[PDB]
Each structure stands twice: as structure tokens, then as C-alpha cells.
Amino acid sequence: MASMKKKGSVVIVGRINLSGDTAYAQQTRGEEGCQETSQTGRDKNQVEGEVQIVSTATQTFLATSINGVLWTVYHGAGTRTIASPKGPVTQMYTNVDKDLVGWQAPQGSRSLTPCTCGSSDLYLVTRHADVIPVRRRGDSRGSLLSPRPISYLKGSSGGPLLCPAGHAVGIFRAAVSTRGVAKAVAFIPVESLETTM
Ligand SMILES: COc1ccc2nc(O[C@@H]3C[C@H]4C(=O)N[C@]5(C(=O)NS(=O)(=O)C6(C)CC6)C[C@H]5/C=C\CCCCC[C@H](NC(=O)OC(C)(C)C)C(=O)N4C3)c(C(F)(F)F)nc2c1
Ligand SMILES: [Zn+2]
Numbered sequence: 090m091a092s093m094k095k096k097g098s099v100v101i102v103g104r105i106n107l108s109g110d111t112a113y114a115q116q117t118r119g120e121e122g123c124q125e126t127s128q129t130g131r132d133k134n135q136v137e138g139e140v141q142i143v144s145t146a147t148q149t150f151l152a153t154s155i156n157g158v159l160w161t162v163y164h165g166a167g168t169r170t171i172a173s174p175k176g177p178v179t180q181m182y183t184n185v186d187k188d189l190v191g192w193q194a195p196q197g198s199r200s201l202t203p204c205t206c207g208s209s210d211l212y213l214v215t216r217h218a219d220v221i222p223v224r225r226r227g228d229s230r231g232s233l234l235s236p237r238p239i240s241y242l243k244g245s246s247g248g249p250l251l252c253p254a255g256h257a258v259g260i261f262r263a264a265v266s267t268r269g270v271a272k273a274v275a276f277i278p279v280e281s282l283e284t285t286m
Contacts, residue, residue: 097127098172099161101134101195102149103142105218105248112218114142130170130177136195140248142216145169151216151248154200155257155282158182158191161247162262162277166190182285188262189277189285201249203279204256211258213274215245223250228278229259236272239264250276 100123103116117134118126123144126132141152143161152161159171163185170177171192182191194200209225213233219241223231231250242264250259259276266272 096167096169097124097146098130098170098177099143099145099152099166100126100132100172101136101141101152102144104136104138105140105142105151105214105216106138107140107214108138112214112220114216114218116142126172130172131174132172133174136197137199139199139201140214141195141198143171143247149216149244150246151244151261153247153249153257153260154194154198155203155249155279156286157194157200158282158286159194159198160189160191160260160277160282162260163188163190165246171195184285187277187281187285189260189282191282191285201251201255201257203283204252204254204258206252206254206256208252208258210253212251212253213245213261214248214251215242216248217241223274225258226273229262229275230265230273231276232273233271236270239266239269239271242271242274250274 150165263275264271
């Protein structure tokens with residue numbers, strides 16, 4: 090028992106900048122500092138924006154602030170704490186059935202508003218800051234207007250699908266792949282997050 094290890098914290102390592110006319114990824118922490126911050130859980134970096142790039146020791150993905158909660162996928166974060174200036178922060182929501190977790194949104198983040206538009210013309214934001222049009226096809230599915238190899242979507246779970254007005258419609262969960270080409274995506278609808286809240 091004496092040598093039983095602790096899994097580290099999720100760490101914010103960058104963000105997707107949507108504040109201007111041009112979407113772009115920004116790295117805010119390199120690999121070595123990420124490893125150190127995962128073990129201590131103490132991240133003194135200033136957080137900005139709605140979409141964070143996050144990492145564990147073994148995986149990197151996205152997390153999205155909606156109504157004061159930073160949300161991501163359970164298949165990325167598990168039950169992990171997130172690093173913050175005051176130390177590790179415990180999840181406030183965990184739902185494996187939805188592939189969903191959330192923590193209180195970091196000080197300095199900005200939150201998206203849940204969409205009430207009832208629109209089916211959506212936009213997926215990836216970890217490379219690509220803004221991909223997606224037609225909504227059901228409660229939890231949308232089609233890519235321009236299909237792409239799954240390589241282009243890998244690492245973007247936890248990112249948002251947005252409506253034309255920039256509201257949050259859902260959280261990207263899984264790619265529907267045929268022969269390595271993503272023609273559609275599965276997402277956690279924001280209504281599911283609102284109920285969890
Ligand atoms: C115990 O609790 C659990 C444990 C494990 C779970 N594993 C789950 O699925 C896994 C992970 C998820 C994935 O790869 N996600 C993305 C990503 O980027 N992840 S990632 O950031 O790289 C990351 C791995 C986090 C670092 C957006 C994808 C981008 C590219 C696709 C790559 C090819 C994979 C295609 C596959 N497609 C699929 O399964 O499609 C159907 C329709 C569902 C069958 C798919 O997408 N995935 C398979 C799910 C889910 F299914 F709910 F998602 N729940 C879980 C609950
Ligand atoms: Zn909307």
C-alpha cells in the first residue's frame with residue numbers, strides 16, 4: 090500500500106482563441122510544466138476564454154465552459170481533479186452514462202450560454218481552431234458538411250458545437266467513422282448538461 094500512486098490532475102495547457110475575427114490555438118504550458126502541474130495540482134497560470142486545451146499524463150483533449158462549469162468527456166478526464174491556483178479541484182459533475190464530467194469554471198474563463206435557438210446549422214470547434222460546419226441530424230448527432238479523416242478530429246472531444254449566434258449546443262463526444270473518414274459526429278446536447286446542473 091505504501092507505494093500506491095495517485096493519478097494526476099487534468100491540466101489546462103492552452104486555449105482556442107475565439108475573441109477576434111480569427112480562431113487560433115494558443116499554447117500556455119509546455120509538456121514539462123504540464124507534467125509538474127499534473128502532479129501538484131497547482132496551476133498559477135491565468136485562464137482566459139471559453140474553450141481550454143487540457144491534458145493528462147497520457148491524453149490531450151478539450152474542455153468548454155458553459156454557465157460557469159468547465160465541461161469535458163469522461164473518456165478523457167475520468168474522475169480526475171483539475172489543477173488550479175489553489176490546488177486540485179474535485180469534479181462537481183460526473184456522469185459516465187453521458188460520457189460527461191464538469192468542474193467549477195476557472196477564475197478568468199468566459200462561459201458560453203446554452204442555446205435556445207432551436208437551430209440545426211451548427212459549428213464544431215476543434216483543438217486546431219478549425220470551425221467546421223455541422224448540420225444537426227438528431228438530438229445527439231450532426232453531419233459534417235465536408236467530411237474529414239478522423240485524424241483531424243482526434244483530440245477535440247470536449248470541444249463545443251455552437252449555433253450561428255455562438256451559443257453552446259453540445260459537447261463533442263465521438264466521431265462516426267467509415268473507413269477512417271468522419272462523416273458525422275456524436276455530441277452531448279447542452280440540454281443534458283442543463284439537466285445535470
Ligand atoms: C468508462 O467510461 C468510458 C470509457 C471509454 C469511452 N470511449 C468512448 O468512445 C471512444 C472515445 C471516443 C473518441 O475518440 N472521441 C473523440 C476524441 O477526439 N477523443 S480524444 O480527445 O482523442 C481522447 C481519446 C480523449 C483523449 C472525438 C473523437 C475524434 C476522433 C475519432 C477517433 C476514432 C475513434 C472513433 C470513436 N467513435 C465511436 O465510438 O462512435 C460511436 C458512434 C459512439 C460508436 C470515438 O469517437 N471514440 C471512441 C465513449 C463515447 F463513445 F461515448 F465517446 N464513451 C466512453 C466512456
Ligand atoms: Zn443559439
